[PDB]
């Protein structure tokens, strides 16, 4: 009656994947942020702490590809993180984005976080 | 023979071996270098010498022509072939057009070679960065660095190797136009910049200069101790 | 699962070409605009630090006298296509005693946009913008790693591509003039850059039948920015 | 796992799976049979028309290798055309070199060693084609050889290749090779090519017939299917 | 076809060449060689791997290879791979003697080898060389020399050296026993037999197990002197006398 | 067990094995054939059989008795394609022996040649090891007849009476029980053992249209395949 | 899916997957329709563009004085088989001093695209050719495939949702034989107007039409000589 | 054939060549053999058991001469043996063409060792599974050398390879000695091959070759049956 639900990580394996089309339906692939959709996760985060009006969310969105909402949740985190470290209050765009270009690259040294290599 | 593509695109857009093999640049000896308006000065540091053994065979500042100096980071083994191929290239340029080798030409040679050395089949890309400094014909000094991508790129001063963010962050506090109004301020500027570098006990600091018409002069440990003397006495004057 | 470097997708197309398209997105931006008088062009150098000298960086090299260019993405991949495309233009001129048209240049490059393999390694990671004036007028072109070459009237690339195109169809019409378009590019650039717009960040490039050449010098750009 | 992928690896029970997969790739293709009489070789290929697809005479699976030798291919089609070009070239080499017309035995060896030669490396894949070879010469007689994708070449009086394979070679033992003239054997093929592949699977079909022997005087050609039209005149009268 | 490939060339995702480290770990086994700071002479040391009583001893050199009039080398590790490298290296030296009518200086002999080992590390999908061998010799310009080889192809000149893993303790012993220009070849050989005494684990330093090859500059002989056991044994008794004398302090 | 890819290509196991050849030793067993060779005093007999599962397949093509030269015959087991591809290399190297060295090749050297080429198939890692089993006979100066066997592992090999294939693990156990005795070997003794050793195996006692007998005998040293009539003369000649 | 790897590996079902994935690359291209009369051959394509400002990427490219081909799918490989197509035309034009019939040209495409479907490390060609020309026996409309199986049809269509074009063509194949050019062309691009959604045009700036005839050399028209053909069509139904 | 050409022999994480160790295990699975140098010439003994009474011992020979003064036996697998047998056959004759002189065995084992070590690294092969014993009488002192799948080469006084080579090794540690005669080497060689044989040893089981200093001579089953009569 409730038509259940399914969630997993990889599409594996083949046998459960070929069994569902005979019964289940609505197989969607994430999505994941759009280039114009990364600011939406910044909109809910625009209510976090105190946001300066000079900040442009469209500027830092392109700099962090495949960051979804999890990796850019650290943006507004590292914003407030280094804010108290520097004893300041708010965080301007240029403030945290200088640390954001670091949080993408320095965390990509050990793993660049590809999903292509999982199923491949 | 050997038909296999080693270096392919990752699904997030990067090449691996190019943008990964700069870690071998990150774990080598450091080398800095500034250019004066008249005399350039470059130098390797973090030599980690055995301090009871020989030193001329571990010399990692060399020449292609007398017009051009070398400096590099990373593992020296792959750098040797780049140096020798660069020398064979810069001699036939003397066989052609009778001016000496302009530095921008030889940096396009190492950069283009290293690019097609990434591009081809079955070849591990080079893991070196390198500097190419030389006061050219018509007396103008300039410098370039390399990249395992193969992107020659003209700086005013250097930081490559271990802690390039440290020294490269330090030279923004250098770049006042007083430095260098004197050549002794350029040399003691390099060594005083290598104070923030590794141990700086006067042993692992090997510096070399080029006075715009002279062959390059490997300085003995004679005035390095005197520049540490006026640098430490200057820090005595700093309070 | 490192499979065949030349293997199709389940969708499906070339895996490695599709991966190559994503390499354009992290490169620097650029703006081309076709004018009835000529072709203006814009790019950003992306200065990394005040250590670096700003004017040694090339994003525009000029292929012939009369055919401009604009590169993107990985520059060291672009230099090979530049140097060989020049050889193809000269070979056209020395078999033919006439200027190679702007169209056939990009056939002569995009016929080897796909040569990777093991026998007979990786595809190129550049997205070029070709300009120029042949007898057919001022043409503005665009090629990709896939070789799918098409005319574009006013093309953006790179990281800024979505907002620059999206904002750029609003401000473009058929009868654009030159000095209108030149200051019509830098508005988009100062919207899309992260450093402050000044004399060291960007470089323009124009090519016309009657304004040539008319290449690219400094202190023109000082007058260009101060008209904002 | 891991024993089916490459062609050059034996499986632990002792057979090669890429060859076995190549055998049943031809199993999905349509039925094409052949038979010889005392003085000729008769071919027949049933061909598939669903609604519109092609003009009559497209992609004919009957080929013509030499003046006196022809194909009757079934399976995947492109590699069959590749074998047609190679067997064509081999008949050109023998014709150019030794001065007389190619016997069917040498042609079966020189083709079958290539079909075998693509089952020894992981450079290539094994072929997915199987074909007939019919011929007639007065110092030779009518021979009919059969090449599978594995590389085995041997000799039938009659054979069948396709989906409906066993059912289309069940009835050939009813016919008699030794006495019959091939002019009978034409309609004696078309009766069961019309009988096999019943029309519930595919709605419509279309027939090719190719006929080499003593009556055609060594030259191999397609019979004019309109001329004598003996097929469906018997075939509509063969349902009861 | 490519899923059977072992990928001997590629960088590994932590920072280092993955294969050259496992190359150096094989040099860490089965080898012991060193040379000494020496004027008017230079010596090499060798440890017998097969000291069984059933060999022939008819080769007249077990770990020393004489590759010119003036030079030699000391194999460490996989021996027959060095039996490729000494054919190649000897042919390099002899073709330089063809092209110039003059003996080959040691430096460009070293780089002329290390470009080949380096050439297998750079490209090929190929098993690298697993030999790290030493060099001695005379030249016109620089007198006496010592050199060091790596599977990566990076070479260094020493004055006292390390082969292989058991010789890092010999490097600590050489720095703790350091000098500047004392040969006096009985001092250098007493130091070398001292180092092979205290580093090698088998007590008392049996006369079969060690091997010393010296090179004295003589005009114009340049003698590569490989010494026999009869002048090894009294050197061993000399060092044992020095241990019995030096232990009397306590 | 196993380590790495040793179950796939011809590289060593940790125990010292290499699995691809010991898969090739039962690549013969798909054939379904018993073949026995017996060396007499002045003669040597090949015996084989065939399976004719169709009435449309021929009796003239499926004969495994292949003739190499005019003094050397051979018979094949194992799979068909590898067996025939071995044969043109045997014929071709025999002919190059005739061109280079001018005299007729001994039966000894051809098995060294074929064994070394089969070694090169085994040695290199990316080529299939040809799972057929080679059996030769022939005549030499002052050495009587000879029999040799070449397995697909690369060793030339030849004995007094040898048989490999499907059922031969018990057939060698019968030939041990038949060879070591005080019996000599006349011609019809060798032929009458060549049938009965196989008839002890299969226990059929069948028609003379099944076994193919090639023979060689130093009165006329040319290799010769018997006609069915004299085969029937032997086969009822053994029935007392 | 470990046997989806390469072109060498057969399936355990008997269907080599790289060919199927290349057929998927055929279907992703735009629609095009080629159809013949007894006296002429007409192939009509539909361009698409990347954006508004970029011009529409063309499909129909001139090949010989009578041979013309459409395309769908990849573009660089279309230039590759295009250059091979020109070169094998003017080879026999150089040697025999006669033009080539079409029916022996396409065997060079099959034997050209065959070898990159068998040997290791070679992809097939994502290709969508609709060949049209004259030999002496009239017009021909062929099609290709990355599996290299060429079909002599009377009318086909390949590209995105091109099956609707077919189900248009089957109820007019009895009437696509006698008629001359001016209604033959609009009979052509009615199939194109069924390949689209029914709420946008059918504009003039996108459709390209190529014809080959006896007294008419192979010609490509582009929006403006097309504008006399698009006039006078029926409205799309409700 | 394709240019795949990658060496499947790589290094371990410990640093051990794995295929050479496994190839030495395949040497250890082989037939036993022993060879003794004694003061005038070198005697090689091998151990050849036919798997049935059907077999012929007259066809295949294990002691195989290379020159008229050089013999060569193995302990391993025959199909990999005969290839480098033939390679040594061709390889000695370029020395006899260039220098016009009977080739020294010392030069043979250098060159064959170069072939084998060079073959352990090349494009996509397994190494040979063969361990050779090479004898000969050059310049007055008879030599006995042993190679291996690692390409190495040793100079043994009197060694043994194959099965139970630690048993025959310790047996040849004491019972082999300072100096013998040519017939006296045959006794202890047949004894140490009689260490690990079956319940009977005839002229068809063993097969023994010698090198005189005047020239090679492979022995016949007449004397091979006469010496082992006389159990060792």
Curated annotation (Swiss-Prot), chain D:
Protein name as catalogued: Proteasome subunit alpha type-3
Major site of localization recorded for this protein: cytoplasm
Residues with PTM N6-acetyllysine: 52, 201, 225
PANTHER family: PROTEASOME SUBUNIT ALPHA/BETA
Cell location: Cytoplasm; Nucleus
Lineage: Eukaryota, Metazoa, Chordata, Craniata, Vertebrata
Subunit structure: The 26S proteasome consists of a 20S proteasome core and two 19S regulatory subunits. The 20S proteasome core is a barrel-shaped complex made of 28 subunits that are arranged in four stacked rings. The two outer rings are each formed by seven alpha subunits, and the two inner rings are formed by seven beta subunits. The proteolytic activity is exerted by three beta-subunits PSMB5, PSMB6 and PSMB7. Interacts with AURKB. Interacts with CDKN1A. Interacts with MDM2 and RB1. Interacts with the C-terminus of TBXA2R isoform 2. Interacts with DNAJB2.
GO molecular function: ubiquitin protein ligase binding
Native source organism of the sequence: Homo sapiens (Human)
Swiss-Prot record, chain E:
Organism of derivation: Homo sapiens
InterPro entries for the chain: Ntn_hydrolases_N, Proteasome_alpha, Proteasome_alpha-type, Proteasome_asu_N, Proteasome_bsu_CS, Proteasome_sua/b
Gene assigned in the entry: PSMA4
Keywords: Acetylation, Cytoplasm, Host-virus interaction, Nucleus, Phosphoprotein, Proteasome
Subunit record text: The 26S proteasome consists of a 20S proteasome core and two 19S regulatory subunits. The 20S proteasome core is a barrel-shaped complex made of 28 subunits that are arranged in four stacked rings. The two outer rings are each formed by seven alpha subunits, and the two inner rings are formed by seven beta subunits. The proteolytic activity is exerted by three beta-subunits PSMB5, PSMB6 and PSMB7. (Microbial infection) Interaction with HTLV-1 TAX protein favors NFKB1 activation.
Protein name: Proteasome subunit alpha type-4
Keyword set includes Cell wall biogenesis/degradation: no
NCBIfam families per UniProt: PRK03996.1
Entry keyword annotation includes Ligase: no
UniProtKB/Swiss-Prot annotation, chain F:
Modified positions (Phosphoserine) in chain numbering: 13, 59-60
Pfam families from the UniProt entry: Proteasome (PF00227), Proteasome_A_N (PF10584)
Database matches in SUPFAM superfamilies: N-terminal nucleophile aminohydrolases (Ntn hydrolases) (SSF56235)
Residues of this chain annotated as glycosylated in UniProt: 1
Top-rank taxon: Eukaryota
A GO cellular-component term linked to this record: myofibril
PANTHER family per UniProt: PROTEASOME SUBUNIT ALPHA/BETA
Protein name: Proteasome subunit alpha type-6
Species whose genome carries this gene: Homo sapiens
Record lineage: Eukaryota, Metazoa, Chordata, Craniata, Vertebrata
From Swiss-Prot, chain G:
GO cellular component: a single term: extracellular exosome
Function text: Component of the 20S core proteasome complex involved in the proteolytic degradation of most intracellular proteins. This complex plays numerous essential roles within the cell by associating with different regulatory particles. Associated with two 19S regulatory particles, forms the 26S proteasome and thus participates in the ATP-dependent degradation of ubiquitinated proteins.
Name this polypeptide is given: Proteasome subunit alpha type-1
Main location as per UniProt: cytoplasm
Encoding gene (name): PSMA1
Entry's induction text: Induced in breast cancer tissue (at protein level). Up-regulated in liver tumor tissues.
Keywords recorded for this protein, A-Z: Acetylation, Cytoplasm, Glycoprotein, Immunity, Isopeptide bond, Nucleus, Phosphoprotein, Proteasome, Ubl conjugation
GO molecular function: lipopolysaccharide binding
Matches recorded under PROSITE patterns: PROTEASOME_ALPHA_1, PROTEASOME_ALPHA_2
Organism: Homo sapiens
InterPro entries the record matches: Ntn_hydrolases_N, Proteasome_alpha, Proteasome_alpha-type, Proteasome_alpha1, Proteasome_asu_N, Proteasome_sua/b
Matching PANTHER family: PROTEASOME SUBUNIT ALPHA/BETA (PTHR11599)
Gene3D superfamilies, per database record: Glutamine Phosphoribosylpyrophosphate, subunit 1, domain 1 (3.60.20.10)
Cross-link (Glycyl lysine isopeptide (Lys-Gly) (interchain with G-Cter in ubiquitin)): 112, 205
Keyword Glycoprotein: yes
Any Pfam family the entry gives: Proteasome
Carbohydrate attachment residues: 107
Superkingdom of this protein's organism: Eukaryota
Subcellular location: Cytoplasm; Nucleus
Matches recorded under SMART domains: Proteasome_A_N
């Amino acid at each position: 009656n409730i038509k259940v639900l399914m969630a997993t990580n990889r599409p594996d394996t083949l046998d459960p994947a070929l069994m569902r089309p005979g019964r289940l339906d609505r197989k969607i692939e994430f999505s994941l942020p759009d280039l114009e959709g990364r600011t939406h996760i910044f909109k809910i985060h625009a209510r976090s702490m105190s946001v300066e009006r000079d900040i442009r969310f469209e500027l830092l969105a392109r700099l962090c590809p495949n960051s979804t909402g999890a990796e850019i949740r650290s943006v507004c985190t590292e914003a407030g993180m280094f804010a108290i470290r520097a004893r300041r209050k708010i965080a301007t765009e240029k403030d945290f984005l200088e640390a954001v270009n670091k949080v993408i690259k320095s965390y990509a040294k050990f793993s660049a976080t590809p999903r292509y290599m999982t199923y491949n | 023979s050997y038909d296999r593509a080693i270096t392919v695109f990752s699904p997030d857009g990067h090449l691996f071996q190019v943008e990964y093999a700069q870690e071998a640049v990150k774990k080598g000896s450091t080398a800095v270098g500034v250019r004066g308006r008249d005399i350039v000065v470059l130098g390797v540091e973090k030599k980690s010498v055995a301090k009871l053994q020989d030193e001329r065979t571990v010399r990692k500042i060399c020449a292609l022509d007398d017009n051009v100096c070398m400096a590099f980071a990373g593992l020296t083994a792959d750098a040797r072939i780049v140096i020798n191929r660069a020398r064979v290239e810069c001699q036939s340029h003397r066989l052609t057009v009778e001016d000496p080798v302009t530095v921008e030409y030889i940096t396009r040679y190492i950069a283009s070679l290293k690019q097609r050395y990434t591009q081809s089949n079955g070849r591990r890309p080079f893991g070196i960065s390198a500097l190419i400094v030389g006061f050219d014909f018509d007396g103008t000094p300039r410098l370039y660095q390399t990249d395992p991508s193969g992107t020659y790129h003209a700086w005013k001063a250097n930081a490559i190797g271990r802690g390039a963010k440290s020294v490269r962050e330090f030279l923004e506090k250098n770049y006042t136009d007083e430095a260098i109004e004197t050549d002794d301020l350029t040399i003691k500027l390099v060594i005083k910049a290598l104070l923030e570098v590794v141990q700086s006990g006067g042993k692992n600091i090997e510096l070399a200069v080029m006075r715009r018409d002279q062959s390059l002069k490997i300085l003995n440990p004679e005035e390095i101790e005197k520049y540490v003397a006026e640098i430490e006495k200057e820090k005595e004057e700093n309070e | 699962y490192d499979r065949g470097v030349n293997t199709f997708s389940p969708e499906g197309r070339l895996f490695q070409v599709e991966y190559a398209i994503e390499a354009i997105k992290l490169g620097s931006t650029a703006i081309g605009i076709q004018t009835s008088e000529g072709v203006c062009l814009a790019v950003e150098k992306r200065i990394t630090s005040p250590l670096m000298e700003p004017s040694s960086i090339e994003k525009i090299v000029e292929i012939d006298a009369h055919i401009g260019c604009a590169m993107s993405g990985l520059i060291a991949d672009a230099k090979t296509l530049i140097d060989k495309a020049r050889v193809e233009t000269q070979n056209h001129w020395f078999t033919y005693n006439e200027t190679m048209t702007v169209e056939s240049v990009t056939q002569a490059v995009s016929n080897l946009a796909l040569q990777f393999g093991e026998e007979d390694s990786r595809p190129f990671g550049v997205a070029l913008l070709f300009g120029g004036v042949d007898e057919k007028g001022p043409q503005l072109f665009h090629m990709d790693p896939s070789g799918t070459f098409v005319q574009c009237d006013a093309r953006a690339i790179g990281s800024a591509s979505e907002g620059a195109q999206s904002s750029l169809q609003e401000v473009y019409h058929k009868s654009m003039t030159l000095k209108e378009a030149i200051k019509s590019s830098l508005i988009i650039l100062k919207q899309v850059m992260e450093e402050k717009l000044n004399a060291t960040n960007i470089e323009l490039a124009t090519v016309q039948p009657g304004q040539n050449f008319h290449m690219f010098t400094k202190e023109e750009l000082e007058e260009v920015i101060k008209d904002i | 796992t891991g024993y089916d992928l490459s062609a050059s690896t034996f499986s632990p029970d002792g057979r090669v799976f890429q060859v076995e997969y190549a055998m049943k790739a031809v199993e999905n293709s349509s039925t094409a049979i052949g038979i010889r009489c005392k003085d000729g070789v008769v071919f027949g290929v049933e061909k598939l028309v669903l609604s519109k697809l092609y003009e009559e005479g497209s992609n004919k699976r009957l080929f013509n290798v030499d003046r006196h030798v022809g194909m009757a291919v079934a399976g995947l089609l492109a590699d069959a055309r590749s074998l047609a070009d190679i067997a064509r070239e081999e008949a050109s080499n023998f014709r150019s070199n030794f001065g007389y017309n190619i016997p069917l035995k040498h042609l079966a060896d020189r083709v079958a060693m290539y079909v075998h030669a693509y089952t020894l490396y992981s450079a290539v894949r094994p072929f997915g084609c199987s074909f007939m070879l019919g011929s007639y010469s007065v110092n030779d007689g009518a021979q009919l050889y059969m090449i599978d994708p594995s590389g085995v070449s041997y000799g039938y009086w009659g054979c069948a290749i396709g989906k409906a394979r066993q059912a289309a070679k069940t009835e050939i033992e009813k016919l008699q090779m030794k006495e019959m003239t091939c002019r009978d054997i034409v309609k004696e093929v078309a009766k069961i090519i019309y009988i096999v592949h019943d029309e519930v699977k595919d709605k419509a079909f279309e027939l090719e017939l190719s006929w080499v022997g003593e009556l055609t005087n060594g030259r191999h050609e397609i019979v004019p299917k309109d001329i004598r039209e003996e097929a469906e005149k018997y075939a509509k009268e063969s349902l009861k | 076809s490519r899923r059977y490939d072992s990928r001997t060339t590629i960088f590994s995702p932590e920072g280092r060449l993955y294969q050259v480290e496992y190359a150096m770990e094989a040099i860490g086994h089965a080898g012991t060689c060193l040379g000494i700071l020496a004027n008017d002479g230079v010596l090499l040391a060798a440890e017998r791997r097969n000291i069984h009583k059933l060999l022939d001893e008819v080769f007249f050199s077990e770990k020393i290879y004489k590759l010119n009039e003036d030079m030699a080398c000391s194999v460490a590790g996989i021996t027959s791979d060095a039996n490729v490298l000494t054919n190649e290296l000897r042919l390099i030296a002899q073709r330089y003697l063809l092209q110039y009518q003059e003996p080959i200086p040691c430096e460009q002999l070293v780089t002329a080898l290390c470009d080949i080992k380096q050439a297998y590390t750079q490209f090929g999908g190929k098993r690298p060389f697993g030999v790290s061998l030493l060099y001695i010799g005379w030249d016109k310009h620089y007198g006496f020399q010592l050199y060091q080889s790596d599977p990566s192809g990076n070479y260094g000149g020493w004055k006292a050296t390390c082969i292989g893993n058991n010789s890092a303790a010999a490097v600590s012993m050489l720095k703790q026993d350091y000098k500047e220009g004392e040969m006096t070849l009985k001092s250098a050989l007493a130091l070398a037999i001292k180092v092979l005494n205290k580093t090698m684990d088998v007590s008392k330093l049996s006369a079969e197990k060690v091997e010393i090859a010296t090179l004295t500059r003589e005009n114009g002989k340049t003698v590569i002197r490989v010494l026999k056991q009869k002048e090894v044994e009294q050197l061993i008794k000399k060092h044992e006398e020095e241990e019995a004398k030096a232990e009397r302090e306590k | 067990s196993s380590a790495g890819f040793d179950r796939h290509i011809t590289i060593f196991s940790p125990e010292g094995r290499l699995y691809q050849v010991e898969y090739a030793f039962k690549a013969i067993n798909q054939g379904g054939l018993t073949s026995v060779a017996v060396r007499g005093k002045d003669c040597a007999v090949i015996v084989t059989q065939k399976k004719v599962p169709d009435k449309l397949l021929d009796s003239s093509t499926v004969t495994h008795l292949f003739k190499i030269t005019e003094n050397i015959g051979c018979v094949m087991t194992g799979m068909t394609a590898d067996s025939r591809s071995q044969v043109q290399r045997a014929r071709y190297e025999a002919a190059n022996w005739k061109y280079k060295y001018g005299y007729e090749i001994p039966v000894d050297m051809l098995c060294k040649r074929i064994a070394d080429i089969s070694q090169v198939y085994t040695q290199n890692a990316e080529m299939r090891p040809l799972g057929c089993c080679m059996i030769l006979i022939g005549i030499d100066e002052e050495q009587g007849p000879q029999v040799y066997k070449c397995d697909p592992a690369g060793y030339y090999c030849g004995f007094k009476a040898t048989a490999a294939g499907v059922k031969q693990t018990e057939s060698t156990s019968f030939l041990e029980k038949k060879v070591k005795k005080k019996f000599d070997w006349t011609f019809e003794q060798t032929v009458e053992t060549a049938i009965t050793c196989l008839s002890t195996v299969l226990s059929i006692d069948f028609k003379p249209s099944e076994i193919e007998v090639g023979v060689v005998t130093v009165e006329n040293p040319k290799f010769r395949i018997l006609t069915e009539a004299e085969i029937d003369a032997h086969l009822v000649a053994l029935a007392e | 899916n470990q046997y989806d790897n390469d072109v060498t590996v057969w399936s355990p079902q008997g269907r080599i997957h790289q060919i199927e994935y290349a057929m998927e690359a055929v279907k992703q291209g735009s629609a095009t329709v080629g159809l013949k009369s007894k006296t002429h051959a007409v192939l009509v394509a539909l361009k698409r563009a990347q954006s508004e400002l970029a011009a529409h990427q063309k499909k129909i490219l001139h090949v010989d004085n009578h041979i013309g081909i459409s395309i769908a799918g990849l573009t660089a490989d279309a230039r590759l088989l295009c250059n091979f197509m020109r070169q094998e035309c003017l080879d026999s034009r150089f040697v025999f001093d006669r033009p080539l019939p079409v029916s022996r040209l396409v065997s060079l495409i099959g034997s050209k695209t065959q070898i990159p479907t068998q040997r290791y490390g070679r992809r097939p060609y994502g290709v969508g050719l609709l060949i049209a020309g004259y030999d002496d026996m009239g017009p021909h409309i062929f099609q290709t495939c990355p599996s290299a199986n060429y079909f002599d049809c009377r009318a086909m269509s390949i590209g995105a949702r091109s099956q609707s074009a077919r189900t248009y063509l089957e109820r007019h194949m009895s009437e696509f034989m006698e008629c001359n050019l001016n209604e033959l062309v609009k009979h052509g691009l009615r199939a194109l107007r069924e390949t689209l959604p029914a709420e946008q045009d059918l504009t003039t700036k996108n459709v390209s039409i190529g014809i080959v005839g006896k007294d008419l050399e192979f010609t490509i028209y582009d929006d403006d000589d097309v504008s006399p053909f698009l006039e006078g069509l029926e409205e799309r139904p409700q | 054939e394709r240019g795949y050409s990658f060496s499947l022999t790589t290094f371990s994480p410990s640093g051990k060549l794995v295929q050479i160790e496994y190839a030495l295990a395949a040497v250890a699975g082989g037939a036993p053999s022993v060879g003794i140098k004694a003061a005038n010439g070198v005697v090689l003994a091998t151990e050849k058991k036919q798997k049935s009474i059907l077999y012929d011992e007259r066809s295949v020979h294990k002691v195989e001469p290379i020159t008229k003064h050089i013999g060569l036996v193995y302990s391993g697998m025959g199909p990999d043996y005969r290839v480098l047998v033939h390679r040594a056959r061709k390889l000695a004759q370029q020395y006899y063409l260039v220098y016009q002189e009977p080739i020294p065995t010392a030069q043979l084992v250098q060159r064959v060792a170069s072939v084998m070590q060079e073959y352990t690294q090349s494009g996509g092969v397994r190494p040979f599974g063969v361990s050779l014993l090479i004898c000969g009488w050059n310049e007055g002192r008879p030599y006995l050398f042993q190679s291996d799948p690692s390409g190495a080469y040793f100079a043994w006084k009197a060694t043994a390879m194959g099965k139970n080579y630690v048993n025959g090794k310790t047996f040849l540690e004491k019972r082999y000695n300072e100096d013998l005669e040519l017939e006296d080497a045959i006794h202890t060689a047949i004894l140490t091959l009689k260490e690990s044989f079956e319940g009977q040893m005839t002229e068809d089981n063993i097969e023994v070759g010698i090198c005189n200093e005047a020239g090679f001579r492979r022995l016949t089953p007449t004397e091979v049956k006469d010496y082992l009569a006389a159990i060792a």
